[PDB]
mmCIF file of C-alpha atoms in Angstrom:
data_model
loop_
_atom_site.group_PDB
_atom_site.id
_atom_site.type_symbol
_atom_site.label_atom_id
_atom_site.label_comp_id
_atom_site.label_asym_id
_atom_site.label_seq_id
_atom_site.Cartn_x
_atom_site.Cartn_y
_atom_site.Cartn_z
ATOM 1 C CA UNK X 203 0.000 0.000 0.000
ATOM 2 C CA UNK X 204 1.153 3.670 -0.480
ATOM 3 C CA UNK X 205 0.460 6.617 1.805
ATOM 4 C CA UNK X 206 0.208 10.377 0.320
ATOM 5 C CA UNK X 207 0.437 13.774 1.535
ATOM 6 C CA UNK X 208 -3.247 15.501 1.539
ATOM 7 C CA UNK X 209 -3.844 19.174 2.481
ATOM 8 C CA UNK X 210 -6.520 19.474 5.593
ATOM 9 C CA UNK X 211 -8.716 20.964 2.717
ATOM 10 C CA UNK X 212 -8.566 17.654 0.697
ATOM 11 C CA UNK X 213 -10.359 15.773 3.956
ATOM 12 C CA UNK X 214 -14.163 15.739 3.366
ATOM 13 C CA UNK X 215 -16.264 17.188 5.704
ATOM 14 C CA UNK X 216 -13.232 18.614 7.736
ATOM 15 C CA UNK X 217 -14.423 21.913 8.644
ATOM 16 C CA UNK X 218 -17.919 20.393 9.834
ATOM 17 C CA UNK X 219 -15.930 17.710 12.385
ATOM 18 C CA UNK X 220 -16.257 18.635 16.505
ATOM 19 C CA UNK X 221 -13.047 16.372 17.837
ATOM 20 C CA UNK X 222 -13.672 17.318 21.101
ATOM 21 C CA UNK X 223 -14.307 14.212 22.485
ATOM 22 C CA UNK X 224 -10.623 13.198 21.384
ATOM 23 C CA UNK X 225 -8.985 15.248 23.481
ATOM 24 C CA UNK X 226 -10.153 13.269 26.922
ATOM 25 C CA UNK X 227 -9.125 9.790 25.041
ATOM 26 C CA UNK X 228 -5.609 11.428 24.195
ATOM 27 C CA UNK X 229 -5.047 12.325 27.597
ATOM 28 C CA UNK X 230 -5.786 8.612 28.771
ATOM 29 C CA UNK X 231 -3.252 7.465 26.074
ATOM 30 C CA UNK X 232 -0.681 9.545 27.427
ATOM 31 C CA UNK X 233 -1.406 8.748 31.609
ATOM 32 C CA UNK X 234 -1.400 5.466 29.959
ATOM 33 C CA UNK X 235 2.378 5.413 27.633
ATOM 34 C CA UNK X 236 4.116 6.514 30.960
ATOM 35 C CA UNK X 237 3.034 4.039 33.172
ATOM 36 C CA UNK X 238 3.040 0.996 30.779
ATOM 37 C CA UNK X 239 4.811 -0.403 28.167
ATOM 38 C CA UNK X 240 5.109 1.256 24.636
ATOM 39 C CA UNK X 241 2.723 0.227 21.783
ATOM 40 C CA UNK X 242 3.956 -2.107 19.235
ATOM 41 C CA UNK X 243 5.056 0.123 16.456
ATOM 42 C CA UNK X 244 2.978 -0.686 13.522
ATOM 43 C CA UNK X 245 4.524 -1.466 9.790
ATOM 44 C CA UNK X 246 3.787 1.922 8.347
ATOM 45 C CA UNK X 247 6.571 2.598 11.183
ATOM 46 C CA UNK X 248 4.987 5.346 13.541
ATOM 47 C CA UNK X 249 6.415 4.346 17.083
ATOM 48 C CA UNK X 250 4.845 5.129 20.455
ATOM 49 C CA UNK X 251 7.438 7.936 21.253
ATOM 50 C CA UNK X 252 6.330 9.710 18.156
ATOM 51 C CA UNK X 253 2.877 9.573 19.198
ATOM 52 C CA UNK X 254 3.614 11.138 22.627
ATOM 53 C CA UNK X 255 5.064 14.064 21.012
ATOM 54 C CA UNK X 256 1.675 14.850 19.745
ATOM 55 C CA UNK X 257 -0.128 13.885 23.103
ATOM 56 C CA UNK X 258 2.010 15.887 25.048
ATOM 57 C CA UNK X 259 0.879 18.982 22.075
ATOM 58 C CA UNK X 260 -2.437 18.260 23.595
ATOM 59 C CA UNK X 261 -1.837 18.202 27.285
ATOM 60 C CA UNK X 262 -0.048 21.278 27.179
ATOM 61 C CA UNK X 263 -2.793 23.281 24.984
ATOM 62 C CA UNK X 264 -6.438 24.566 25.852
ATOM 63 C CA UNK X 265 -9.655 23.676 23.416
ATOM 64 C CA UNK X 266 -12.405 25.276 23.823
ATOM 65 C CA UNK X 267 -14.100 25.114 20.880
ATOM 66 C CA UNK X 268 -14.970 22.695 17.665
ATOM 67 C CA UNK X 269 -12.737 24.919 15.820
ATOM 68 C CA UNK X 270 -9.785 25.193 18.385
ATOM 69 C CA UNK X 271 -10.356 21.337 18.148
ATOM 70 C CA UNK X 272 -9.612 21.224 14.706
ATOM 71 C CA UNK X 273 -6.902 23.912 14.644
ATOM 72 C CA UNK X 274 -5.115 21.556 16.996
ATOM 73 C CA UNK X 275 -4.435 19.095 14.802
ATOM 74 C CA UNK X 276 -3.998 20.990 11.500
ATOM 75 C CA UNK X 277 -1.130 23.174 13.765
ATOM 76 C CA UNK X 278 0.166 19.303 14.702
ATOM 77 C CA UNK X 279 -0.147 16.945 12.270
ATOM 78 C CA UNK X 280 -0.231 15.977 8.768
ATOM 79 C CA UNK X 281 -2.582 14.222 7.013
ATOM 80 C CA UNK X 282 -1.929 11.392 4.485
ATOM 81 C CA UNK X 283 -4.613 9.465 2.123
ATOM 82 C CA UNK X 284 -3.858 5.593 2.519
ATOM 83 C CA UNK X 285 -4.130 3.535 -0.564
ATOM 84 C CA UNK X 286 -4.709 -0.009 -0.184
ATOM 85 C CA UNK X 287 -10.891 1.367 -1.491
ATOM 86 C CA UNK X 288 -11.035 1.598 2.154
ATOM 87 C CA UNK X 289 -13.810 -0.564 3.932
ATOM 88 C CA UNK X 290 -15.452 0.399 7.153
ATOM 89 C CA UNK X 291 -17.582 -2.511 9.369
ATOM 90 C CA UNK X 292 -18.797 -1.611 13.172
ATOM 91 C CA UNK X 293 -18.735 -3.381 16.525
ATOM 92 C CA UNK X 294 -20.320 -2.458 19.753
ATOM 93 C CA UNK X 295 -20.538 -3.445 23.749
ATOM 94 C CA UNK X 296 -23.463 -5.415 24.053
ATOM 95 C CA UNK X 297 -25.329 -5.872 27.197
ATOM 96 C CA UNK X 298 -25.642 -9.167 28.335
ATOM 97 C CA UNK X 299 -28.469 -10.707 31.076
ATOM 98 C CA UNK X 300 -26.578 -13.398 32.996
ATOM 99 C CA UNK X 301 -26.566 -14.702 36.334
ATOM 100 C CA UNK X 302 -24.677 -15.920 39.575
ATOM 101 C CA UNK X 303 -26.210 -19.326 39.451
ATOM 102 C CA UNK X 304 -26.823 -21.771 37.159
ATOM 103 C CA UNK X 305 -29.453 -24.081 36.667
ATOM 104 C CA UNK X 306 -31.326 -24.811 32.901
ATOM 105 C CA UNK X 307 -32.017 -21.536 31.951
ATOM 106 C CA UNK X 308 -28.775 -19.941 32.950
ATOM 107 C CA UNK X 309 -26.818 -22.366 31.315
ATOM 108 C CA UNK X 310 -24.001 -21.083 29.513
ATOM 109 C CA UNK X 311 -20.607 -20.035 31.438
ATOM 110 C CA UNK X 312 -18.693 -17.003 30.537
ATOM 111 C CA UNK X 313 -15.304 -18.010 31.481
ATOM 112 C CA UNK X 314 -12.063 -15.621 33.099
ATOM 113 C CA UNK X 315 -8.472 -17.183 31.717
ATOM 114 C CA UNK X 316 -7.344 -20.086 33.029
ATOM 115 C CA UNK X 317 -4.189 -20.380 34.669
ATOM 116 C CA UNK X 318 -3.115 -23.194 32.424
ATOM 117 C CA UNK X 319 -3.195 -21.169 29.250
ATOM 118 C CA UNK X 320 0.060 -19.709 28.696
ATOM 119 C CA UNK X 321 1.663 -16.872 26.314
ATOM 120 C CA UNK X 322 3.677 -18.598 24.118
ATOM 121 C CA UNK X 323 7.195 -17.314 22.545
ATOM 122 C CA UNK X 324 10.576 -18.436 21.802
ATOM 123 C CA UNK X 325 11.670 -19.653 25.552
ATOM 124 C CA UNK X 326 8.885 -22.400 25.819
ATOM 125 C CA UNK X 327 7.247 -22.869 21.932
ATOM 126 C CA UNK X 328 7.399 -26.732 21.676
ATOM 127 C CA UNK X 329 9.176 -28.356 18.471
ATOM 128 C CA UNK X 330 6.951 -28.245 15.227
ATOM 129 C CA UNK X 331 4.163 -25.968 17.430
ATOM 130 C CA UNK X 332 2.049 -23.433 15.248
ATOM 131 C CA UNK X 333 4.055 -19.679 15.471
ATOM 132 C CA UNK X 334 1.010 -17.651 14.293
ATOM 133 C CA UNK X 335 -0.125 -19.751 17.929
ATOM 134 C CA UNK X 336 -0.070 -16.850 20.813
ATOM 135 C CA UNK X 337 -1.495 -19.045 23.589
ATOM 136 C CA UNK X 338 -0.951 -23.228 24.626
ATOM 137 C CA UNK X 339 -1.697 -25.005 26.879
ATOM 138 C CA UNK X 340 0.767 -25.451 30.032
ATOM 139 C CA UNK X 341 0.580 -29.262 30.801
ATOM 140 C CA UNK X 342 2.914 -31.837 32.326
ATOM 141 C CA UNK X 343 4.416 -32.996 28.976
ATOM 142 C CA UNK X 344 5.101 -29.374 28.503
ATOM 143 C CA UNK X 345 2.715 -27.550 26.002
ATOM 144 C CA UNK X 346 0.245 -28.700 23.800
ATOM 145 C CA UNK X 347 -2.578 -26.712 22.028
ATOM 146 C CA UNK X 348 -5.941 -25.785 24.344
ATOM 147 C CA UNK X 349 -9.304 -26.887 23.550
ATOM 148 C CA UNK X 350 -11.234 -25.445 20.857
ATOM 149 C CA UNK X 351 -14.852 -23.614 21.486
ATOM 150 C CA UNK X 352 -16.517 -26.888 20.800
ATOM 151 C CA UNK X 353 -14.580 -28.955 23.553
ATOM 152 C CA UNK X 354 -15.143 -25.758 26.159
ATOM 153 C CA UNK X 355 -18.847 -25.669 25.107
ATOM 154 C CA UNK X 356 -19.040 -29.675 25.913
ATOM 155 C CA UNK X 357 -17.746 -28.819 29.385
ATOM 156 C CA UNK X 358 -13.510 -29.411 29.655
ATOM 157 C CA UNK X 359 -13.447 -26.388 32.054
ATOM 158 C CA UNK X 360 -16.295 -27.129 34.560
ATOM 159 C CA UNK X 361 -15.912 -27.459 38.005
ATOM 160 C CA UNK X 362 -13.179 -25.574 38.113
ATOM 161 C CA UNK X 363 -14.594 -22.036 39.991
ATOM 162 C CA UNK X 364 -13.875 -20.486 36.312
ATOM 163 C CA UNK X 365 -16.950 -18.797 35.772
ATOM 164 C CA UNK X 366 -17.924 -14.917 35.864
ATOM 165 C CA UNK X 367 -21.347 -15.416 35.365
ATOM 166 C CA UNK X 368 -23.814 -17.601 33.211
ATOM 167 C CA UNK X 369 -25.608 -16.613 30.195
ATOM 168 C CA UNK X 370 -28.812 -18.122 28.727
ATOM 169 C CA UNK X 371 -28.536 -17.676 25.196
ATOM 170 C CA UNK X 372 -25.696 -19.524 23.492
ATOM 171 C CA UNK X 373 -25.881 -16.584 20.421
ATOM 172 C CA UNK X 374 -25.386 -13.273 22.225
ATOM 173 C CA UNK X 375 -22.710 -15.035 24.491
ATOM 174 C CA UNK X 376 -21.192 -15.877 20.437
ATOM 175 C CA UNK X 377 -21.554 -11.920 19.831
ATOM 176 C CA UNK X 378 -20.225 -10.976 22.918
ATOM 177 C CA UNK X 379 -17.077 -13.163 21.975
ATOM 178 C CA UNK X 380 -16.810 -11.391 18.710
ATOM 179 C CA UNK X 381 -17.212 -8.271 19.840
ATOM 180 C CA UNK X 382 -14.573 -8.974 22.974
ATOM 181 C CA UNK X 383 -16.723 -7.181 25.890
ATOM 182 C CA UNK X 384 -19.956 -6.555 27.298
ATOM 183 C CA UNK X 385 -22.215 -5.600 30.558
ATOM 184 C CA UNK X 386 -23.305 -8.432 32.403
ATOM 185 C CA UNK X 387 -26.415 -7.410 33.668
ATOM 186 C CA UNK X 388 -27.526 -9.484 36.684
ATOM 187 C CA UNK X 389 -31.697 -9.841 37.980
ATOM 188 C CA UNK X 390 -30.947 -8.072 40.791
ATOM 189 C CA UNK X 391 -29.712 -5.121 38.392
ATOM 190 C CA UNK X 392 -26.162 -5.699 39.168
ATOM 191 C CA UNK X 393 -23.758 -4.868 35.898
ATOM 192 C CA UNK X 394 -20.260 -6.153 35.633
ATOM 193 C CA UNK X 395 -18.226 -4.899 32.952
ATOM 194 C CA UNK X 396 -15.960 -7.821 30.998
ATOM 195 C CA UNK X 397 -13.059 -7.449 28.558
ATOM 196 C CA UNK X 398 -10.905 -9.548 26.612
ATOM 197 C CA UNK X 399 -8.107 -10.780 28.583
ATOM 198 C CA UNK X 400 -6.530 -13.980 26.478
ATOM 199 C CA UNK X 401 -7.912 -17.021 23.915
ATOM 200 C CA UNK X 402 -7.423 -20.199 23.428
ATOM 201 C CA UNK X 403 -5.346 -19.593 20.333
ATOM 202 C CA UNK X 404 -7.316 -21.172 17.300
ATOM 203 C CA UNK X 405 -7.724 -18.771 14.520
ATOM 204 C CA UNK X 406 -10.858 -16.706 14.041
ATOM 205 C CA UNK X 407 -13.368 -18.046 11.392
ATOM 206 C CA UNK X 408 -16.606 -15.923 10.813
ATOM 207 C CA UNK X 409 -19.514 -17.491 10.894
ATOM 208 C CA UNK X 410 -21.344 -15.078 7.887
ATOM 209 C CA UNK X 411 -18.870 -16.008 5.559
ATOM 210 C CA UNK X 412 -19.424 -19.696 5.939
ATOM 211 C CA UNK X 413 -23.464 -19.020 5.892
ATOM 212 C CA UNK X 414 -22.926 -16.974 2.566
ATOM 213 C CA UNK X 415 -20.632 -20.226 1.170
ATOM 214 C CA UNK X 416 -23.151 -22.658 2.150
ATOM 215 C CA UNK X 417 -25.893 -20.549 0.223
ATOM 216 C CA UNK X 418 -28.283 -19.799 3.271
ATOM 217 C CA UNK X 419 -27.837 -15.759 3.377
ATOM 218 C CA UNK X 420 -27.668 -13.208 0.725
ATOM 219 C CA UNK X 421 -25.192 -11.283 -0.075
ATOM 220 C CA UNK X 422 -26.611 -8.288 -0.290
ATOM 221 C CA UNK X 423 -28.482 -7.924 2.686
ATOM 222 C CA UNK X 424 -26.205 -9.965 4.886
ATOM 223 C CA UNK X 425 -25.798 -8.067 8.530
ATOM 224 C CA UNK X 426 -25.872 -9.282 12.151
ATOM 225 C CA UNK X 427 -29.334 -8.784 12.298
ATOM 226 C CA UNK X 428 -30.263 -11.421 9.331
ATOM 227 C CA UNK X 429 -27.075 -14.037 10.845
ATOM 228 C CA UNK X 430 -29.136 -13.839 14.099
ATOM 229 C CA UNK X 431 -32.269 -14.217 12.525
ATOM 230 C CA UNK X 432 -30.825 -17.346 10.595
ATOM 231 C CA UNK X 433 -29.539 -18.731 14.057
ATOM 232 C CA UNK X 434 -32.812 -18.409 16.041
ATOM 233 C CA UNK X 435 -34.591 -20.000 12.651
ATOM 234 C CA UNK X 436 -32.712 -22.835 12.719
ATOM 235 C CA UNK X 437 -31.838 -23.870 16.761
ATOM 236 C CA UNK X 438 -30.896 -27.745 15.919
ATOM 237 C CA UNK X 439 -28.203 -26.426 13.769
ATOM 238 C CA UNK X 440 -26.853 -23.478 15.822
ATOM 239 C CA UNK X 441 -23.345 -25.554 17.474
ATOM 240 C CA UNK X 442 -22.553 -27.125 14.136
ATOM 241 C CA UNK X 443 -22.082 -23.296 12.930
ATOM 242 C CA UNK X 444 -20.768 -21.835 15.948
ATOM 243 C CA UNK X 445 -18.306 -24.311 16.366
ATOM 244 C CA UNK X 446 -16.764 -23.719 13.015
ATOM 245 C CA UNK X 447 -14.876 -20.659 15.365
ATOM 246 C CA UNK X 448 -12.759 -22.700 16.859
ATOM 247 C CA UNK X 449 -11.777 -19.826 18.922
ATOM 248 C CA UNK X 450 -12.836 -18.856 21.961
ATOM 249 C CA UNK X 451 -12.309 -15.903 23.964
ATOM 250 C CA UNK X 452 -11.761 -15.676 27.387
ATOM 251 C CA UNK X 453 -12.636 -12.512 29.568
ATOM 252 C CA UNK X 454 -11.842 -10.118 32.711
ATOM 253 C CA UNK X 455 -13.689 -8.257 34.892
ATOM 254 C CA UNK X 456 -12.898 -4.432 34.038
ATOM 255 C CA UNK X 457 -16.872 2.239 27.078
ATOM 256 C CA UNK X 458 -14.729 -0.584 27.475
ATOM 257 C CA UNK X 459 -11.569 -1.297 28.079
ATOM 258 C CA UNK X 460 -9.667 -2.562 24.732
ATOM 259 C CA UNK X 461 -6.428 -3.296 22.706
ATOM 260 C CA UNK X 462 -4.765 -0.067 23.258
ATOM 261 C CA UNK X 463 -5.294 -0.443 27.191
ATOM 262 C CA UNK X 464 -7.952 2.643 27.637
ATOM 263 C CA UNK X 465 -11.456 3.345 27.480
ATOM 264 C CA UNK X 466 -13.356 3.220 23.750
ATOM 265 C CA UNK X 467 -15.111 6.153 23.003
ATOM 266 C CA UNK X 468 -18.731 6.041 21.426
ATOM 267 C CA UNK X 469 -18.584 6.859 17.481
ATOM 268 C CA UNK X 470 -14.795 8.002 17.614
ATOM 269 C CA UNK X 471 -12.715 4.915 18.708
ATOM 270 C CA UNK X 472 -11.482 2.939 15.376
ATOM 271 C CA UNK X 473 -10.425 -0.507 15.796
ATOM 272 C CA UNK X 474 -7.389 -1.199 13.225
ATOM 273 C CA UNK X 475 -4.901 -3.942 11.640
ATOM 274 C CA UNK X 476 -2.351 -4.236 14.331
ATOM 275 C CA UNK X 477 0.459 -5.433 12.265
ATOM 276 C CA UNK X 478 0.245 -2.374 10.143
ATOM 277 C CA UNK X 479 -0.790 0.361 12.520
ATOM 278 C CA UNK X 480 0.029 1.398 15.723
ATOM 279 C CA UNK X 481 -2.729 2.317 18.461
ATOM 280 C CA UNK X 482 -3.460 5.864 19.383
ATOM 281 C CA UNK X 483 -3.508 7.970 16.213
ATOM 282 C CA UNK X 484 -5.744 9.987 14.438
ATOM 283 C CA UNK X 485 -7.481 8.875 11.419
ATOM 284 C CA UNK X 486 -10.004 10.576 9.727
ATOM 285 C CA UNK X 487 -12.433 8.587 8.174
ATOM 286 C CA UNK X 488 -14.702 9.425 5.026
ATOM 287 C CA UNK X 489 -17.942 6.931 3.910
ATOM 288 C CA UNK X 490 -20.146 8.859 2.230
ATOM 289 C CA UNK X 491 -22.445 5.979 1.269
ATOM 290 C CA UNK X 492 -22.775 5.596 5.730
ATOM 291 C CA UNK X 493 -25.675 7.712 6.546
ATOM 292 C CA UNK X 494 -27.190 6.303 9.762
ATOM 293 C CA UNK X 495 -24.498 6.808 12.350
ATOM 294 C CA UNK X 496 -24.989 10.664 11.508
ATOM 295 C CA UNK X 497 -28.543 10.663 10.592
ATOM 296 C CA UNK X 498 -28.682 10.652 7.290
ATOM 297 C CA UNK X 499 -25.441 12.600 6.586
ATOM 298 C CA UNK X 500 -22.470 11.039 5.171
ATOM 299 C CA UNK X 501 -19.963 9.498 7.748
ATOM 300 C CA UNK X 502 -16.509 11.655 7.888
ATOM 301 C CA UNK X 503 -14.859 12.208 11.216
ATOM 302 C CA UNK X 504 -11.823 12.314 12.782
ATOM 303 C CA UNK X 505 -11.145 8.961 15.088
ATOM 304 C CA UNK X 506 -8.317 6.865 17.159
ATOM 305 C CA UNK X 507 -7.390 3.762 16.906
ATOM 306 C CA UNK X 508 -7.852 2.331 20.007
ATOM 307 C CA UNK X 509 -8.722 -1.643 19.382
ATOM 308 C CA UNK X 510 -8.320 -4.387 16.813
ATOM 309 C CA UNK X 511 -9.995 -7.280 16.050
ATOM 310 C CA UNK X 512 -8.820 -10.660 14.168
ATOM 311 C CA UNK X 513 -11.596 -9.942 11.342
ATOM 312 C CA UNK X 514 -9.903 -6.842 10.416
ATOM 313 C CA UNK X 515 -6.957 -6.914 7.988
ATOM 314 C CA UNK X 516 -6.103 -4.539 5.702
ATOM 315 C CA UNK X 517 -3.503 -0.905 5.625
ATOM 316 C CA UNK X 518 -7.622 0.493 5.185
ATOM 317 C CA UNK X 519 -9.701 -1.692 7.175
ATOM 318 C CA UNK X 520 -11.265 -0.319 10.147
ATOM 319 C CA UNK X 521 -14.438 -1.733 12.549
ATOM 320 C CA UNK X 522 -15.894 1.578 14.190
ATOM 321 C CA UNK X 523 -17.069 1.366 17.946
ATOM 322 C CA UNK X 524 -20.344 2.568 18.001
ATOM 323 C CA UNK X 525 -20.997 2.389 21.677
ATOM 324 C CA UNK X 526 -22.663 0.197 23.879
ATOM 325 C CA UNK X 527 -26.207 -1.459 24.249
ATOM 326 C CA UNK X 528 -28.883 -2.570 22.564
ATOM 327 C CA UNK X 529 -29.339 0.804 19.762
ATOM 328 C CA UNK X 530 -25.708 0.784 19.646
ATOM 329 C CA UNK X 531 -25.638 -2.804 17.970
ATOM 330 C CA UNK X 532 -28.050 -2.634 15.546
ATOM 331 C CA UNK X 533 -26.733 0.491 14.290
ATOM 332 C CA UNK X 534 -23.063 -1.998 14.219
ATOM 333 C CA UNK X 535 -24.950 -4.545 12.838
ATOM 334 C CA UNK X 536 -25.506 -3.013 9.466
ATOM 335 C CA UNK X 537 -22.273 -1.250 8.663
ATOM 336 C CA UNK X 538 -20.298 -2.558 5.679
ATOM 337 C CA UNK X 539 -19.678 0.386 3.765
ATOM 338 C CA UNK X 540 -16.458 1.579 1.033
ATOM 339 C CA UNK X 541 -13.805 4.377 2.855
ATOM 340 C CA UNK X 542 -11.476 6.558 2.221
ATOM 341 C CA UNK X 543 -9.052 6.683 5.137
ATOM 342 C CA UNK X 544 -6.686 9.501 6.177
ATOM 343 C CA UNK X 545 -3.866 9.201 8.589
ATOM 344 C CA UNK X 546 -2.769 12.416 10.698
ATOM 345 C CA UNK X 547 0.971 11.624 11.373
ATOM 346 C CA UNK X 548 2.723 13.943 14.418
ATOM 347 C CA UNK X 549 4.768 16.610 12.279
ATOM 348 C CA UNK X 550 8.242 15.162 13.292
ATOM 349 C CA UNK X 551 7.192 11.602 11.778
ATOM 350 C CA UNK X 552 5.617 12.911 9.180
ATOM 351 C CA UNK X 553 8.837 14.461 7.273
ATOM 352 C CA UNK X 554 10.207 11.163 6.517
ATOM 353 C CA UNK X 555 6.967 10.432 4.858
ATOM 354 C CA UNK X 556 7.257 13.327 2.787
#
């Protein structure tokens, strides 16, 4: 892919933007940089460091104002088209009903890591294991690969005190894995927050690509809404599908908490390809053809990338947080829209880009 030098002019929509909310989410990026490790530098080769230059631009300065928002960043950064069109999906925190006890309607465990499933690098990565494999399983004979969602569905982690809470539909507990957090809500009105905190390590399959293979969705309507329609229509067939993901995400107790380490921010966190980019920058985001996250006016805003998810590959691929609840998902659930995406680089990185 290439990256190009725009003018703040050549960004759709610019001068209608209010980044305001970005400025809060900046400063938990920075509280966050120098009190934990750095980032992972992405490919396109911003690092961390550079990316506190500009947070430290925004600590130091006052906004008061959609325009002094703006002027911020046109004072700070430079803007860059990234050529691959760009395509834009959306996830969401879903609330989830669950309970402290189970019995035949609360049924279905939500699980926190177990203590057996291990990081896996260079020191202990067993002869002829998968290296694309981040997590194994810590046994006696040394490591082996852990149990896929079917064999944790058919119970090889019961009895163990592993549970959070339990769930009684096996779908939205799906979503919630695919979406990596939610709110337990309890029946005595209790919420718990949950986040991703490790996975077995199996690869991510999605399940609408294998119901658009096997014929039984269209194309062109295909959205979360119809894949959940398709899954209460046909209940006998519901594991067979599910299963296919052999991965299976395990959670912590903690908008929510995500890959970049700090809170996601309704309709302005961007969740990105982590090889390629790294967390915390601005990217401003055109999608003319998106009308209903800005009723009825074309999507363009400026965003940071604050998560990533396994589905999303690609130098312009993004999944855009739209918040969290039930309204919140089924505007997600419908977002598959083209992109043009726009990276603001902090003006010291952005000379050898030049």
């Amino acid at each position: 892919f290439s990256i190009d030098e725009v003018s703040f002019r050549d960004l759709p929509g610019w001068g209608q933007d209010d980044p305001r909310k970005l400025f809060p989410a900046m400063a938990t990026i920075l509280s966050h940089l120098r009190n934990a490790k750095p980032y992972r530098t992405g490919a396109l080769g911003i690092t961390a460091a550079e990316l506190v230059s500009l947070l430290e631009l925004a600590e130091r300065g006052q906004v008061n104002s959609p325009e002094q928002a703006r002027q911020f960043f046109e004072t700070n950064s430079v803007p860059f088209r990234i050529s691959p069109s760009g395509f834009v999906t959306a996830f969401y925190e879903p609330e989830l009903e669950v309970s402290a006890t189970p019995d035949d309607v609360w049924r279905y465990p939500i699980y926190r890591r177990p203590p057996e499933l291990v990081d896996i690098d260079n020191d202990n990565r067993p002869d002829g294991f998968d290296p694309s494999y981040a997590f194994g399983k810590a046994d006696e004979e040394g490591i082996s690969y852990f149990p896929d969602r079917r064999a944790i569905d058919e119970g090889c982690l019961r009895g163990r005190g592993l549970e959070i809470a339990w769930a009684r539909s096996k779908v939205d507990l799906f979503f919630v894995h695919v979406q990596g957090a939610a709110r337990l809500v309890f029946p005595d009105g209790a919420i718990k927050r949950i986040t991703y905190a490790a996975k077995a390590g199996h690869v991510f399959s999605p399940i609408g690509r294998l119901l658009l293979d096997r014929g039984e969705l269209d194309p062109k309507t295909i959205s979360m809404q119809t894949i959940r329609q398709w899954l209460a229509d046909h209940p006998d067939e519901v594991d067979g599908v599910l299963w296919h993901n052999r991965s299976y995400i395990f959670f912590r107790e903690a908008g929510p908490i995500a890959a970049a380490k700090v809170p996601l921010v309704a309709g302005r966190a961007l969740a990105v390809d982590r090889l390629i980019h790294t967390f915390g920058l601005p990217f401003f985001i055109h999608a003319p053809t998106l009308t209903h996250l800005d009723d009825g006016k074309p999507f363009a805003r400026l965003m940071l990338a604050l998560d990533t998810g396994s589905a999303i590959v690609g130098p312009a691929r993004g999944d855009i947080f739209t918040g969290s609840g039930f309204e919140a998902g089924e505007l997600a659930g419908t977002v598959r829209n083209e992109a043009d995406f726009y990276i603001l680089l902090p003006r010291i990185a952005a000379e050898r880009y030049r």
